[PDB]
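Quick check before the chapter quiz. The format below is the same one you will see on the exam, so make sure you can read both the input and the output lines.
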Amino acid sequence: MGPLWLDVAGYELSAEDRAILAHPTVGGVILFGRNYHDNQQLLALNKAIRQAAARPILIGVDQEGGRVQRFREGFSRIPPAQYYARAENGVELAEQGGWLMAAELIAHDVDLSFAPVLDMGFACKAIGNRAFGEDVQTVLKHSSAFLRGMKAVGMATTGKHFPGHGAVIADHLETPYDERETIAQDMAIFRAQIEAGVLDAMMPAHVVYPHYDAQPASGSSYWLKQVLREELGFKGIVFSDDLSMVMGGPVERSHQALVAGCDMILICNKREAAVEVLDNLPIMEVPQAEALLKKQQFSYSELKRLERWQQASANMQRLIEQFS
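Here is the expected output.
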């Protein structure tokens, strides 16, 4: 695997997608709703992706439940992360949620979902009910549960959005700011999940914490190195934010993400810029990214035979209905 995650246009690989997936700078492919028509089509495309790379490669997606579920039709609907803690059954249900979400991606040949959201609070319009809670305990208590489900089926985990996007309650510049003099609680959540060793990966917030550092966390040496590696001893993979959203052109920016301390970089919704990176960036391997590869393998028929799937999909459906 190389460092670059990119995307494709639709339901099937084009000639150009194929030539690009064979380039050793690509490490992974991130799928969106636009790449999903139906269960069999999804399987066929993921099979075509792995085939064109002729080498291990990652297939990722943002499948959190609720406001962010790329694949809905033909899947179990997963509730907003927020709901779990509102049932008096929350830990039990969050785990089922995480297990069901993870299990079904895997059943369709996807390695990982970019989750869980470890942000605190609901006031950030963009995070909202994507968060597990408004306080450190609620959040830790329920995302640990979601985390454990993911891991039970062999799915690598990704805490986002470090060091915490849940209080970004402002908005007329290009980059979002969070001007608190301290974000100690928001970050205590990432710290504990790191210490417990339950995250394989971490996605940084594209947010400036002016009290701390001038750069957006996703592109900040302080946040990704001093804080994330040195102060917290995180040992997993570090993603960049989508490098499409100062620093220079595509290849200039990627280079900064990497120097800032990202192990991998995402370039979405801009094919020309991904290609510019493939053509001009010196080749680097990210072998430790092998750790994100899904660890189990099964089909959707085999899965739908576990009592566990039958309970979980029934229990998620009613959890959703319970809080319309």
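If your answer matched, good. The beta strands are 4-6, 26-31, 58-61, 63-65, 68-69, 112-113, 158-162, 201-204, 237-242, 264-266.
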